[PDB]
Every structure is written in structure tokens, then in C-alpha cells.
């Protein structure tokens, strides 16, 4: 968007002052939408010397004569030209500016407008900026942040030593990565994205996206009336072990609940019988194993089972030992079908295999699994969308990096999912999503499309749970999938 | 407001381009508020070469990429600098402009945005501008006018040969006289007044006002609990004749229904008995007249009746003959109380008397009565607020010039009333308003305040009638006054 503002001024010829005026009035309107009538409130506007501060002076000026009181505290040592222009207007209109933040000043105001730093912040916040931000956060006032809460790195969502906790953030043109990834997402509060007059073509030239309800609705496959089960695809799920007998069942029902026609599971005997006792609509093939885990002796049978399906999911509950590792890698190297690779299949995966496959794959790691896959620390991979993009491009796959905000990428397009809640931070949730992705691929969506629709619907289903989210289990999530689909439509 | 825009740019330093951008975005938001989601509509924007047209280019540009279709027809031979600037932006953003209005083009659009002429129009519209405006008015499309419907004289509300009939008019800063007086008021449709960033001090330096609910609520007098009838004033109404026996009754009840403490009527016997048969709370004093009309022989009695009141109303139903003329003028010259002068008292009034009175007066003519009073034609006085102001200043009075839009002025402040409906175009309505004004003066409001509150409440009462307005009568209006007061509070 730094690019976007510059082209809009330099190539399109929109005066920088017009963009700044539109930015500020949009904050005023946003506030009115959340607070109702503004005339009873007293506003403290905290302005930096940059263009975020300039936007703050526009806000402040537009409140003059209309609200109970407005004061600007200017916290800068110099002003960008647009900030200087809007400072001068604020003062010409009769506005009061002070240059020293006295901690008790907070007592006399209802709303704090945070226009200290925007996307221009670089480096840790120190000194008196930090003391001020901390005082605002302890004040209990309503906080409205201009563009991004001050102290959030707009490219990453990390806190730069400290940051404002906003009730309402008003950003311009498009959301920033820092609104979408945590901790930034938490500090943003309610986000409104304001149209401030950039050409719609430039706004739409962005290559990273938030997954929206309208996007998912347009990707949901068609259900032709004259269909039969094969119309809706066939999935094989290779999953489970004597240790982990539940995973197959959750993956399988995840495929069925999204509309897949036929789902079969290959599960070590007698753990395969667990699935049909719970959901007799599943096909749960018994696999004769030596000690309760898949091994190379099961390679040929699993390849034969794969011949008559559209997609294969592998990994949930397989276990991780050397014999599973041999099986997984040899299977994936030979399988000429799309694969969804999760859990223990990721843990044992040789990435060389991904490079040599002709068929597509989707990988669904959490950050612990991603860290192991690229031999890095969890902190180095968590919310690292550039790493994810590089990995997907280098390995010719779709990568679905699960977290509260889920990143989906094929290395060219990257999508961020914000549906869900903490009830999904519980064993079994990932197994459901794996089945969902395979099911949608089986119905004819591309690996990327299937991943996009699935992460959104999985999170939206969680949110439809009727009692406290901490009590949500994967079994209940399964029941909520068709409701999420209905509500989406 | 020509003044207002210039000071805002030249003294306050707001770039003219910023004001024009704010004007245009305000039209977009106004449209969304009335049409809902704009994305399904096709917009035809008609732009002149002036700043109204410039505002139109801002509207058009802001719709690009967001609605079904936008086309501008540019109808000018040259462009003001701001219009030229916004034309260039419109084109840079990919907007289509044609310079010839083909009559069938209307078929392909849902909404016409009228940005041809604003407050800059001078003189009759001829030629192809007129043909275009007439085609828009025959088209049945939704019409949104920028600032004022093109063809209305913004200072007077007259049609300059022809004018656009708008469904929605969006004006900037303040309403214009042309929105408020007819025929302009009719052609405006629904009016929204947008804040486009003028300093609130300049907006409030205007000396003419629309009478609003908030103004009337703040002027309504207090009702202290420990009161008695005298707290709320005493009114004498000198009214009626053998020809016109109903007028006194309507005036008297008009005073009582607005909260006046005591109302007495002086009416020629036996017509005085009509009043108490209908409303026995009135005092209706019998006056012994020679032939059924007040004359000089009743002067002394009426002066004695005036000693114990706060205000005297005179005129409704008196009749107009030489003996009434002698009485009225001698009475008013001698009466040292505020007077409300209506109807036949206006018809016989010698304005020299107004100049020589020490006490205040309010006059309540309709345009026929005003025309007779200043010896002009009805067309010369109707909606002539400058004449009204001159008359009030020269005669030291408040003038209430009744019409669908009522003008109230003391020569320094002028207020326009827009409440009411056509049920008030019926005999008896004016007699009620006279009593209302006297009553409010008796309660302690200034002549100007009393006139302001009364015209608003009188019109608002009419609008509360539950059946078709053409069936409203003065008797029913009386019943609705206390409801208007309640609703106002």
C-alpha cells in the first residue's frame, strides 16, 4: 500500500492532501458508526509527525465545533508536509495542540484517537513514546487507532516493544498483514477498511487475500440434480494405528460432511472396526499389519485401493517410526493421484518426494510440524508467510500452515483465514480439516481452492457451536459443518 | 455560501480541491443511504462546466469500479480549474465521457445525477440545456441533484424557464433559500445538507434560519409547578362581527391550547354567545354595537378590557368598513400592550400607527393581505423575504408572512417554517395561529420567539391529523395542538 498511495498520487494525479482528508473523515464516520452520536464525547488525539499523525490532525479538525471537547497532543519533532498542512488547518480552525503528554490528561477525555505511528514504524518503540502507549493501555478509555495500532509492525503483526490495544482500528484501502496475524490481530480490535479513493484496479492488484464469505460462496461446487455418488468424488484415507484409532473416523466424516460421494479408510485391523461402529456410512478397510502400524508390506494393497479414487489423504494417527516413514515415502513417490499430507505423514516425509511427484499435493502442518519439516524452530516458522510461499513454490505444493490465523499458499497466491475460535485448539480438529480438503478436491476443486474453502468452513463451523467454545470437540464440529455450508449459501 | 467557500479557502487555507472531493463523496454516501447498495445501479452523470459539474466528476469517479455502469455526459464549453482537475481524474481512473446527449441514452441508466448547474446559474435556461432537462423530467428515472436542482434560482426558489425535478438533492454546508421557497422546494425532493468541512463558526454566522424542532423545543416556555393562571398570561382577543361569528372562538382556543392562563374575547353581542356554547372555558364579553361591527363607540370599553391583560390580538372576523377602520387605528395608537394584528385589522391598518406605537406588534398577513398593506401585487410580495425584512425594520414589528413556507422576520433575523400541509389552506386556520402567537407572548416569549414557535407548532399539528389532510378543519387542528407540543418535547 505504500506503493498504492504513491501510484495514486504520482500516476493517477490525486493530490496527497485529498487522500489524507479522505483518510481522516473515514475515521470520524467509523467512530460514529460504533459510538453513535459523537457530540457527547471528549476526544484526545495523539499525533505523530508522520502521515499517520497528519490523518490524526484531519480527524481532530473535523471534530471541532461538533463534539464536547478535542485536544491534540503532538508527539513528534518534525512533520511531513501533509502533516504540517493539516496541523496548520487544525490550528486555523481554532484547535488546541499541546506538546507534552501529562498522564492525568487522560482523566478529562472519553476517547483516545491513536495517530502516533502507522505503517511507517520501524524498530522498537522506546522512551517517552513507550511510556505514553503504556499509559493509554492502562487508562480504560475507548481507543481508536488510525491505520494500525501504534507499535504493531504492519508487515508481520509483531509488537515493536509495546503497542496500543485498540477497540476500533480504521485502515485505508486494504487490511495490512499486521491486522491479520497475531499479536497484531488481537491489538486491532474491530477492523474497518475504508475506501479513501485509490483506483479499484490498484486495490485489486494485491496478491495476498483475506478469505471472505463471498469468495468461499463462489468456490463451493455445484450440486447437479441428476447426480450419483461418483459425481461427488471418491476419497481414500490412509490413517490410524493401534495407538491412534480415532483419527481415521474424524478424517473420513470430514470428507462426507462436505458432500463427498464415497469415502473409504484404510486402517490397521481391528482398529478399522471403530469407524463403522460410530458411522456405518464409512467404508473402513481392514489392513493386516505386523504390529499395528502401516509398513512396506502394506504398500501394494494401499496402491490398489488408490486406483479407484480421486484423492488420497494420508497421515492422521499413523504413528511415527521407521517402518511408517518407509511406507509413507514409497507410497507418495508411487501414487499418481492428488494427496493431502497431514500429521505423522508430514513428520516422516522426505521432501525430495514432493519434488519428484507429477501429481499435486496439499500439506497441512501446524507450526511444530512445519518447523520439523524445514529444520527450523517454531518461532522461525510461525506466521512466516514468506517461508510458506518459498516452500510451496520450491516443492510444487499447496501449504496450509495452521494457526489461529491460517495461511494457505501455492507460492503465487497467499490467503489468510480468520474464522475459528479456541475450541479448535484441541486434538481431532486437524484430522477433520484433512478430510474436508480431500473431499473438496475429490469434488473437483483445485488443491488451492479446496484448501481455501475448507479452512474457512472449518473455522466457521467452530463458531456455530451453541455453548462455550472451550467445550467444542471434533465430533461436534462434524455435526456443524453442514450448517456452516447452509449459512454460507 | 459563495462567501463561505471563499473564506474557507482563502482565509482558512482549505484547498478548493478538498472541498470539491468532500462535496462529491457526500453525494455518494447520500445516495447509498436512500438507494441502499449502489452496486446494482447504472449511473448517468450530467456535468456542466462549473464547479457543480466538478462535484459531478467527483461523484462519477467515486462510482467507478463499484457500480454496474457510470457514464458522464459533459455539457459545457469550458471548465473551471476544479472542474478540469476532476474531469482529468475521472478520465485517468478509466471513466467514459461523452459530449452529446442522445435522448435514448436514458434507457440504459437507472439513476441520473444532475450536476449541470448549481448556485452559479444566472438567467433563463435555453437551448439544448432546456431540452435535456425536459427529457430527464419525462424519463421516470431516479434523479439526484447536486447542490440544487439545475434551473432553480438558489436565492429565490423560482424556476429559470425549466428545472430538474429531483428525488433527492444533496446540498453543502447549509440549505439555500431555493430549497425552502416554492417552486424550488417542490423540485428539491428529499433534501440532505452535507458537512463538507467549512468551519462551524462560518456556517453559524448565517442570519437566516430554518425553524427546527430543536430550536422550538429550546424556546418552549417553562411550566413551574407552583403556578396559577396569571403565571401563564392573559390575552384579550378583539374579534368577530355579525358576519363572522366563528373567528373569535378559533383564536381564543388557539391561545388556550398553547398553555395560556386566561383568554377573554370581546365580540359584538349576541355573536359573543357562540364562543361559550362551544368552549365554556372562554370568557366571551358581549360588546353593544350599533350594526354588528366594532366602531369608535366601543373604543373606551376595549381599552378598559385591555388594562388587565398581557397581550391583545385584534382582527379575525372584524369586517372591513370605515367604522371598523376608525376603531382599529385609534385603538392600536392608544393601546400600550403588545398587539397581534391579523386579518381585517391588517386590511384597515394605517402603517403610520405602527411607527408611532411604543409597544411591539406582530402582523400575520397572507400574501393578499401583505399586497394590500404595501400597495403591491401578490406576485411582488409572495415569498419576498427582502421586502418582508424591510417592512419589519421600517415599522418596528415582527412580520409573519404566511404561505406553504412561512417567513417570520423582525428585520434582523429571518426564519423560514416548513411544517404544515394543504389542510391549512382552508378558512379558520389563520385565526388559530393568531391565538397561538398571542398566547405565547402572554407566557413571556418575545414577539419573534412567539411567532417562531407558533408557526412551527401550527404546521406540525396539521401534520398529525390522522386522516386525509384535505379533510382537516380548524376545530380538529385545535385538538391536535397539545399532541404537537408533547411530540416536540
Amino acid at each position: 500500500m505504500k506503493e498504492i498511495d504513491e501510484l495514486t498520487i504520482k500516476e493517477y494525479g490525486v493530490d496527497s492532501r485529498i487522500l489524507m482528508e479522505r483518510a481522516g473523515i473515514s475515521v470520524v464516520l467509523a467512530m460514529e458508526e460504533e459510538l453513535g452520536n459523537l457530540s457527547d464525547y471528549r476526544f484526545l488525539v495523539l499525533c505523530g509527525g508522520g502521515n499517520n499523525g497528519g490523518d490524526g490532525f484531519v480527524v481532530a479538525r473535523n471534530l471541532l465545533g461538533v463534539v464536547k471537547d478535542v485536544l491534540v497532543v503532538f508527539l513528534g519533532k518534525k512533520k511531513t508536509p501533509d502533516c504540517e498542512y493539516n496541523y496548520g488547518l487544525y490550528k486555523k480552525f481554532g484547535g488546541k495542540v499541546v506538546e507534552q503528554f501529562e498522564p492525568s490528561i487522560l482523566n478529562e477525555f472519553d476517547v483516545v484517537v491513536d495517530a502516533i505511528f502507522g505503517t511507517g514504524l520501524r524498530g522498537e518503540i522506546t522512551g517517552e513514546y513507550a511510556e505514553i502507549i503504556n499509559l493509554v493501555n492502562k487508562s480504560g478509555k475507548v481507543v481508536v487507532s488510525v491505520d494500525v495500532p501504534s507499535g504493531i509492525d504492519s508487515n508481520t503483526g509483531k509488537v515493536l516493544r509495546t503497542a496500543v490495544k485498540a477497540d476500533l482500528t480504521v485502515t485505508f484501502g486494504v487490511p495490512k498483514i499486521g491486522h491479520i496475524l497475531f499479536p497484531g490481530r488481537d491489538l486491532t480490535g474491530k477492523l474497518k477498511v475504508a475506501n479513501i479513493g485509490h483506483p479499484v484496479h490498484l486495490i485489486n492488484s494485491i496478491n495476498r487475500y483475506v478469505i471472505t464469505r463471498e469468495m468461499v460462496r463462489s468456490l463451493l461446487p455445484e450440486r447437479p440434480r441428476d447426480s450419483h455418488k461418483g459425481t461427488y468424488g471418491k476419497v481414500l484415507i490412509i490413517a490410524g494405528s493401534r495407538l491412534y484409532s480415532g483419527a481415521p473416523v474424524l478424517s473420513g466424516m470430514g470428507s462426507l460432511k462436505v458432500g463427498t460421494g464415497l469415502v473409504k479408510l484404510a486402517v490397521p485391523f481391528p482398529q478399522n472396526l471403530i469407524a463403522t461402529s460410530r458411522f456405518p456410512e464409512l467404508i473402513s478397510v481392514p489392513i493386516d499389519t505386523e504390529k499395528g502400524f502401516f509398513s512396506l508390506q502394506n504398500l501394494q494393497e494401499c496402491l490398489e485401493l488408490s486406483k479407484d479414487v480421486d484423492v488420497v489423504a494420508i497421515g492422521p494417527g499413523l504413528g511415527n517410526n521407521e517402518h511408517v516413514r518407509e511406507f509413507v515415502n514409497e507410497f507418495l513417490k508411487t501414487l499418481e493421484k492428488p494427496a493431502v499430507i497431514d500429521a505423522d505423514a508430514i513428520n516422516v516425509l522426505d521432501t525430495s518426494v514432493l519434488k519428484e511427484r507429477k501429481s499435486p499435493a496439499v500439506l497441512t502442518p501446524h507450526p511444530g510440524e512445519m518447523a520439523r519439516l524445514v529444520k527450523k524452530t517454531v518461532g522461525d516458522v510461525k506466521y512466516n508467510y514468506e517461508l510458506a510461499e518459498e516452500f510451496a513454490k520450491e516443492n510444487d505444493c499447496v501449504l496450509v500452515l495452521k494457526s489461529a490465523t491460517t495461511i494457505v499458499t501455492d507460492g503465487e497466491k497467499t490467503l489468510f483465514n480468520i474464522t475459528g475460535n479456541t475450541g479448535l485448539s484441541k486434538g481431532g480438529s486437524g484430522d477433520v480439516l484433512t478430510g474436508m480438503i480431500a473431499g473438496f478436491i475429490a469434488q473437483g476443486l483445485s488443491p488451492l481452492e479446496a484448501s481455501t474453502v475448507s479452512v474457512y468452513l472449518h473455522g466457521f463451523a467452530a463458531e456455530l457451536f451453541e455453548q462455550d467454545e472451550r467445550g467444542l470437540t471434533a465430533s461436534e464440529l462434524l455435526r456443524l459443518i453442514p450448517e456452516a455450508i447452509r449459512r454460507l449459501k | 455560501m459563495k462567501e463561505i467557500d471563499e473564506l474557507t479557502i482563502k482565509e482558512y487555507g482549505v484547498d478548493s480541491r478538498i472541498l470539491m472531493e468532500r462535496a462529491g463523496i457526500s453525494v455518494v454516501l447520500a445516495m447509498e443511504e436512500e438507494l441502499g447498495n449502489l452496486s446494482d445501479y447504472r449511473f448517468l452523470v450530467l456535468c456542466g462546466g462549473g464547479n457543480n459539474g466538478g462535484d459531478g466528476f467527483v461523484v462519477a469517479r467515486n462510482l467507478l469500479g463499484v457500480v454496474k455502469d457510470v457514464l458522464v455526459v459533459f455539457l459545457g464549453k469550458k471548465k473551471t480549474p476544479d472542474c478540469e482537475y476532476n474531469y482529468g481524474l475521472y478520465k485517468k481512473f478509466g471513466g467514459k465521457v461523452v459530449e452529446q446527449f442522445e435522448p435514448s441514452i436514458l434507457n440504459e441508466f437507472d439513476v441520473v445525477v444532475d450536476a449541470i448547474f448549481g448556485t452559479g446559474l444566472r438567467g433563463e435556461i435555453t437551448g439544448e440545456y432546456a431540452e435535456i432537462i425536459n427529457l430527464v423530467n419525462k424519463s421516470g428515472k431516479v434523479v439526484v441533484s447536486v447542490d440544487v436542482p439545475s434551473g432553480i434560482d438558489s436565492n429565490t426558489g423560482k424556476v429559470l424557464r425549466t428545472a430538474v425535478k429531483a428525488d433527492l438533492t444533496v446540498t453543502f454546508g447549509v440549505p439555500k433559500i431555493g430549497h425552502i421557497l416554492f417552486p424550488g422546494r417542490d423540485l428539491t425532493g428529499k433534501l440532505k445538507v452535507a458537512n463538507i468541512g467549512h468551519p462551524v463558526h462560518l456556517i453559524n454566522s448565517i442570519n437566516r434560519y430554518v425553524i427546527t424542532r430543536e430550536m422550538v423545543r429550546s424556546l418552549l416556555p417553562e411550566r413551574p409547578r407552583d403556578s396559577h393562571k396569571g403565571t401563564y398570561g392573559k390575552v384579550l382577543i378583539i374579534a368577530g362581527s355579525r358576519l363572522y361569528s366563528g373567528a373569535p372562538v378559533l383564536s381564543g382556543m388557539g391561545s388556550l391550547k398553547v398553555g395560556t392562563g386566561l383568554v377573554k374575547l370581546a365580540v359584538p353581542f349576541p355573536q359573543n354567545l357562540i364562543a361559550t356554547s362551544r368552549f365554556p372555558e372562554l370568557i366571551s364579553v358581549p360588546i353593544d354595537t350599533e350594526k354588528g361591527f366594532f366602531s369608535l363607540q366601543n373604543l373606551q370599553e376595549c381599552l378598559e378590557l385591555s388594562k388587565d391583560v398581557d397581550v391583545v390580538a385584534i382582527g379575525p372576523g372584524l369586517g372591513n368598513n370605515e367604522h371598523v377602520r376608525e376603531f382599529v387605528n385609534e385603538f392600536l395608537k392608544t393601546l400600550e400592550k403588545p398587539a397581534v394584528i391579523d386579518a381585517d385589522a391588517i386590511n384597515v391598518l394605517d402603517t403610520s400607527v405602527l411607527k408611532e406605537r411604543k409597544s411591539p406588534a406582530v402582523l400575520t398577513p397572507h400574501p393578499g393581505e401583505m399586497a394590500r398593506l404595501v400597495k403591491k401585487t401578490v406576485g411582488d410580495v409572495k415569498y419576498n423575504y427582502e421586502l418582508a425584512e424591510e417592512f419589519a425594520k421600517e415599522n418596528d414589528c415582527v412580520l409573519v408572512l404566511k404561505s406553504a413556507t412561512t417567513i417570520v422576520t423582525d428585520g434582523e433575523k429571518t426564519l423560514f417554517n416548513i411544517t404544515g400541509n394543504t389542510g391549512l389552506s382552508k378558512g379558520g386556520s389563520g385565526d388559530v395561529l393568531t391565538g397561538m402567537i398571542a398566547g405565547f407572548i402572554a407566557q413571556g416569549l418575545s414577539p419573534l420567539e412567539a411567532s417562531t414557535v407558533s408557526v412551527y407548532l401550527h404546521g406540525f399539528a396539521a401534520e398529525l391529523f390522522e386522516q386525509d389532510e384535505r379533510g382537516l378543519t380548524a376545530s380538529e387542528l385545535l385538538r391536535l395542538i397539545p399532541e404537537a407540543i408533547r411530540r416536540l418535547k
Binding site: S26, N195 | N37, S39, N62
Partner: peptide, 6 residues
């Protein structure tokens, strides 16, 4: 939605 995506 002309002004805001929420």
C-alpha cells in the same frame, strides 16, 4: 459498503 469493508 461504498465506504467500509467490515
Amino acid at each position: 459498503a461504498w465506504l467500509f469493508e467490515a
